[PDB]
Every structure is written in structure tokens, then in C-alpha cells.
Write a protein that binds this ligand. Sequence first.
Ligand code: CL
Ligand code: CL
Length: 57
Amino acid sequence: RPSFCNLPVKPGPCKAFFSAFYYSQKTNKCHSFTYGGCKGNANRFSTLEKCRRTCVG
Ligand SMILES: [Cl-]
Ligand SMILES: [Cl-]
């Protein structure tokens, strides 16, 4: 997988309520999170299938 998949999930400090997905090295799976809308990192996807295409297979 791309190395940025292994960055830690980062909701950030803002409090908007964006639905998103991230990859976890613990599971080799994508999971949901709530992105607050600012200061995130690249382990963040708008859809489950994009997270999977990028990080899972
Ligand atoms: Cl998955
Ligand atoms: Cl797809």
C-alpha cells in the first residue's frame, strides 16, 4: 500500500461533520471517522471504495 495509508487517523480540531474513511494498519481495513474539516492528513477518503482502492486492494 502507499506509505501514507499508515499515517494515523486525524480528525483534526475543527468541528464540522464530514463523513470520511481511513485505513488502519491494525486491521488492514478501512474504517469510518468524522473529519472536523481542517488540519487533516492524507489518510482520509470521501468514500469507502476510494479508501479501499488506495490502501486495501
Ligand atoms: Cl476494508
Ligand atoms: Cl472502486
